[PDB]
Amino acid sequence: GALFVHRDTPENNPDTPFDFTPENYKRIEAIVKNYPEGHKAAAVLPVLDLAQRQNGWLPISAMNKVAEILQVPPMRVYEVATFYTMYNRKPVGKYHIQVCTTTPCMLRNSDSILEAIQKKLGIKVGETTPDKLFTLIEVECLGACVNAPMVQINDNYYEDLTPKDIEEIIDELKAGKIPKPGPRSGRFSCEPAGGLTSLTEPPKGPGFGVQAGL
Amino acid sequence: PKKTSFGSLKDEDRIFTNLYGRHDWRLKGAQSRGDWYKTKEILLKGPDWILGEVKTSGLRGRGGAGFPTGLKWSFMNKPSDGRPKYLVVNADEGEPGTCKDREIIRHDPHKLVEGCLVGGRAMGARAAYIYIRGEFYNEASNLQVAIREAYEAGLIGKNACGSGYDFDVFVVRGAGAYICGEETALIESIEGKQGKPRLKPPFPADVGVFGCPTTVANVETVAVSPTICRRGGAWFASFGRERNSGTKLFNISGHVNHPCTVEEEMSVPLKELIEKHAGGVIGGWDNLLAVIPGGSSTPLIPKSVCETVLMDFDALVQAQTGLGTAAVIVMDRSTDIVKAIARLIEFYKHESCGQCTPCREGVDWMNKVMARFVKGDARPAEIDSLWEISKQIEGHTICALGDGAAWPVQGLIRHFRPELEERMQQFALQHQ
Amino acid sequence: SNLIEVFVDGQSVMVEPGTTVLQACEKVGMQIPRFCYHERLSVAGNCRMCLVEIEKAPKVVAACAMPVMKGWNILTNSEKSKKAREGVMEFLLANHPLDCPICDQGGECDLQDQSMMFGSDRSRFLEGKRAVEDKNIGPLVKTIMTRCIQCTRCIRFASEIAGVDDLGTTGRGNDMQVGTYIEKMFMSELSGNIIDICPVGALTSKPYAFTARPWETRKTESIDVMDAVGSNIVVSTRTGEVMRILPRMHEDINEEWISDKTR
Amino acid sequence: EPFDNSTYRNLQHHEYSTYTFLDLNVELSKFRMPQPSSGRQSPRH
Numbered sequence A: 001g002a003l004f005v006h007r008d009t010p011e012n013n014p015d016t017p018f019d020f021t022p023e024n025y026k027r028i029e030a031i032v033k034n035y036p037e038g039h040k041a042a043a044v045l046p047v048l049d050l051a052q053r054q055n056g057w058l059p060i061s062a063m064n065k066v067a068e069i070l071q072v073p074p075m076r077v078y079e080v081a082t083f084y085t086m087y088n089r090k091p092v093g094k095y096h097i098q099v100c101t102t103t104p105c106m107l108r109n110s111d112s113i114l115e116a117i118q119k120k121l122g123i124k125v126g127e128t129t130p131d132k133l134f135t136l137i138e139v140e141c142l143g144a145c146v147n148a149p150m151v152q153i154n155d156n157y158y159e160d161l162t163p164k165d166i167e168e169i170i171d172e173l174k175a176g177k178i179p180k181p182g183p184r185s186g187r188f189s190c191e192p193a194g195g196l197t198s199l200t201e202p203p204k205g206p207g208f209g210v211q212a213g214l
Numbered sequence B: 001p002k003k004t005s006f007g008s009l010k011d012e013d014r015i016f017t018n019l020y021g022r023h024d025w026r027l028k029g030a031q032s033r034g035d036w037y038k039t040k041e042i043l044l045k046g047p048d049w050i051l052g053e054v055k056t057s058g059l060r061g062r063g064g065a066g067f068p069t070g071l072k073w074s075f076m077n078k079p080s081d082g083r084p085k086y087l088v089v090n091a092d093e094g095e096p097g098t099c100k101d102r103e104i105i106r107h108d109p110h111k112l113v114e115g116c117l118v119g120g121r122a123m124g125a126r127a128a129y130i131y132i133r134g135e136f137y138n139e140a141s142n143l144q145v146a147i148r149e150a151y152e153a154g155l156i157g158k159n160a161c162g163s164g165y166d167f168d169v170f171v172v173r174g175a176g177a178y179i180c181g182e183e184t185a186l187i188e189s190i191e192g193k194q195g196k197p198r199l200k201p202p203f204p205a206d207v208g209v210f211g212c213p214t215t216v217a218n219v220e221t222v223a224v225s226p227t228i229c230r231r232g233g234a235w236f237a238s239f240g241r242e243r244n245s246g247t248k249l250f251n252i253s254g255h256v257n258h259p260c261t262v263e264e265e266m267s268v269p270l271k272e273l274i275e276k277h278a279g280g281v282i283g284g285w286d287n288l289l290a291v292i293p294g295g296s297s298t299p300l301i302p303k304s305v306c307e308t309v310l311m312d313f314d315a316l317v318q319a320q321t322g323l324g325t326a327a328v329i330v331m332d333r334s335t336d337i338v339k340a341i342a343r344l345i346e347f348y349k350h351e352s353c354g355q356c357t358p359c360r361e362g363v364d365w366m367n368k369v370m371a372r373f374v375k376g377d378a379r380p381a382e383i384d385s386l387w388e389i390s391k392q393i394e395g396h397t398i399c400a401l402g403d404g405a406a407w408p409v410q411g412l413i414r415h416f417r418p419e420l421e422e423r424m425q426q427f428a429l430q431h432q
Numbered sequence C: 001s002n003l004i005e006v007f008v009d010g011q012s013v014m015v016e017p018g019t020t021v022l023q024a025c026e027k028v029g030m031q032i033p034r035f036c037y038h039e040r041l042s043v044a045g046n047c048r049m050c051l052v053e054i055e056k057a058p059k060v061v062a063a064c065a066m067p068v069m070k071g072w073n074i075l076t077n078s079e080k081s082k083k084a085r086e087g088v089m090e091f092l093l094a095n096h097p098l099d100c101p102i103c104d105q106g107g108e109c110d111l112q113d114q115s116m117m118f119g120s121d122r123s124r125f126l127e128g129k130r131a132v133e134d135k136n137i138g139p140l141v142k143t144i145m146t147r148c149i150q151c152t153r154c155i156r157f158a159s160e161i162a163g164v165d166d167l168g169t170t171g172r173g174n175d176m177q178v179g180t181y182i183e184k185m186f187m188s189e190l191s192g193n194i195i196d197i198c199p200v201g202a203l204t205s206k207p208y209a210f211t212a213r214p215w216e217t218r219k220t221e222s223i224d225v226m227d228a229v230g231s232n233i234v235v236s237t238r239t240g241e242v243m244r245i246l247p248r249m250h251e252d253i254n255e256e257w258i259s260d261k262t263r
Numbered sequence D: 001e002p003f004d005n006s007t008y009r010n011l012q013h014h015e016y017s018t019y020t021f022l023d024l025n026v027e028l029s030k031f032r033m034p035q036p037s038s039g040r041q042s043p044r045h
């Protein structure tokens, strides 16, 4: 669903307590400095992201605070928040389980991993665990297509996943231990699963086939 | 004289030497691998020289289009007009099947930084805005670590490499949108507004980010640009067919035994690349049903054509498809092609920015039609209806996402109309 | 000294450089169909109905934003342009709600008239239409947002002409809706003008709601007396009773807007 | 030294934090240079 109409709730209201930590303020001012003078609105997307990091989700009070700190009308902030997917306009769990289901990643049976998540957490797609730990939601391509069906958790990618490995990942997250980012089998990042079909000789050092003039 | 079987690229002549992170990705390892070497000479040679050697190299846009990189970059060789000039490196990487950009960012970021430097000098830009996607947080942090290393080393910043040039490389993070890969949509996303693409009566060379002239390139082309300057334009021109030169990062996935990413020369035989680098299709080449050459945008192609197809832009254009981003997606005989294409259309519907009518309304309609097709809830006439709808979408949208959503439907119809007909007949007989 | 010669259906027209294709066509007399283009607001180019064919060019250009160049021959009535118009209007009419008998825009709806002239006579849409929750913006403009075609003309009018930046969009795809997100009435002296701006019945005059039909009201031109600007208005009266006040274009007094105290 | 192609060394991304990107952007600002100014402090100004 994800209704794009903010209805005032006792938890999500303009009076909801929100602010920015002083270190977060310094990050905001650096981000603003990273843009040409007179176009401070260009910092809206990262600044809002900061409001996410120190709040998990984005309350409407954070929306208005971003508008104030960026001297931008609140409607533009609301628009950029509702448009982009990563901004969580509604409270979310600690571990956002995002499972890719596009064709390149579904072809290798991503549905098995999705069903393994559903069975392990007892949570259907689009809900949050009752203990507010995991939130299983479905996403489009996340960029790791050459890898087997991967899963994104908050900030970490986990590729080459097979139901058993993601069972380990989930119950390890339940125990507080962070799983090691990367494919959960063999291959480090993207090399051929069999061996190495290229880059076998040491790369040539400074100066190799350099044009004479240069 | 002229190579016939363009393929089997050698290890010596490879732009990226650290695909799989086998060597130090910091400044020390990059310098060990020939990166950041003799950059001052390229900087002082002159922007016209860099642009001319890029044209000589014959580099075509490796981001999804096929525009000559030399011509597009020389579009900015105009004199100053008071407004600053900006180079922007697209790292959205939202097209399904694409995996190259992530690998180069997280394994060879210094090549990317040197690419921004040399490109900005060639086009006179004052700073670079590498727009990485929001998901690639680790990749963005690695890129920024390399940026900090280069800044400390003095290669970039004030007096870049001692050549008197002043360049900056900001990395703006995305927020989870595939349409942000579009250059004008990327420009507005950087500018703070939503990722809706802009119409192009004005061009980025005239009006871009913040209104100042901007030029959007791809991660791969800017990454190879310093290597193009160092090794030489003719050295790049040697590889690949005519007008289709250079080496490309092919991302092989789908139903391949060993999906991977390889830096192979252009106009390569598809069968040979699938067999050697990827390990062949699961169940052998006979078990191959279809191949998507360059990502969701490029229409799929059947095995009969896949038998002998070179992997250059023109060869796939003759094959009623496109090279796109060199995203090989193989589907075996155990694949529901209707289901896969419907999933692609669902992805496009979920990623449409909704600005213009043909993409906002048309793509959703195609999604519903394909959803009915997967269950065969239709009649033979709606196949032609879907073809007409796809044609109406084509050439009528602000950006190319409408065409990139219409092309898979056209390819699926053109190569598997009997499959849809038979599935529809099975549903009709079952519903009796 | 700078006029460039452009062709419209073969006719040669002198146009000042920077003139868009739509204005060049208007010079001849042809009025390119449009929904998102208002001569007072900025150019948007999202409706895609101004898609016109340029000779020796295999791409239908957007006449609302494409500047003409020397030697162009705008084939307004070419088969390609007609097919483009038919396809775009099919896309527009796909998810539109069957509200013509209940919609006050009926009889003066741009969508209805352009469908009559530049559009097909049937539909090939055999699926379920969309529906959008209505939004409240005050006691003057009734909003039925399921009729919205997302031309973003109200947003541009609020941003530029009205100044207040409280209207905009939300979401993407087919679900991207035009509104205020949070509850906030669009309160301005020029608010009611959005009723004129909306080409469909999405934004309608609340006091006029369900009172008369456009084809039956007699229009009498007059001068506003509320303020001292003296805006020219059209009183639409039926059965010897005043029903609504519409703005009349003057380009000096009130452009084509009126205040809320006048409407 | 022996060109150990068999191991992966890009493990520095494992020990990254929530603010690592922005924090590493912060102290990178002092190596930047004066941004250009368009005149007015905002398009609305």
Ligand SMILES: Cc1cc2nc3c(=O)[nH]c(=O)nc-3n(C[C@H](O)[C@H](O)[C@H](O)COP(=O)(O)O)c2cc1C
Pocket: B060, B061, B062, B063, B064, B065, B066, B067, B069, B072, B090, B091, B092, B093, B094, B095, B178, B179, B180, B181, B182, B183, B184, B216, B217, B218, B219, B221, B399, B400, B401, B404
């Ligand atoms: C929907 C869409 C998505 C795109 N995504 C990307 C992308 O992820 N990366 C990219 O480099 N180019 C992408 N492009 C292409 C750019 O818009 C642009 O043409 C290109 O980056 C220009 O640089 P190039 O000539 O080096 O390819 C996309 C285009 C469209 C229409």
Ligand code: SF4
Pocket: B179, B196, B197, B351, B352, B353, B354, B355, B356, B357, B358, B359, B360, B397, B398, B399, B400, B401, B402
């Ligand atoms: S084609 Fe789709 S993504 Fe592109 S501008 Fe139109 S609605 Fe937006």
Ligand code: SF4
Pocket: C096, C097, C098, C099, C100, C101, C103, C104, C105, C106, C107, C109, C110, C111, C112, C147, C199, C200, C201, C202
């Ligand atoms: S806006 Fe026009 S087409 Fe839509 S219901 Fe009203 S009269 Fe009919």
Ligand code: SF4
Pocket: C147, C148, C149, C150, C151, C152, C153, C154, C155, C178, C197, C198, C199, C200, C202, C203
């Ligand atoms: S409400 Fe009316 S004016 Fe506003 S975008 Fe929708 S159709 Fe256009």
Ligand code: FES
Pocket: A100, A101, A102, A103, A104, A105, A106, A140, A141, A142, A143, A144, A145, A149, A150, B096, B097
């Ligand atoms: S398809 Fe699963 S990551 Fe791109």
Ligand code: FES
Pocket: C033, C034, C035, C036, C037, C044, C045, C046, C047, C048, C049, C050, C051, C062, C063, C064, C065
């Ligand atoms: S009028 Fe030109 S596209 Fe809307």
Ligand SMILES: [K+]
Pocket: C105, C194, C195, C196, C197, C198, C199, C200, C201, C202, C203, C204
């Ligand atoms: K109206």
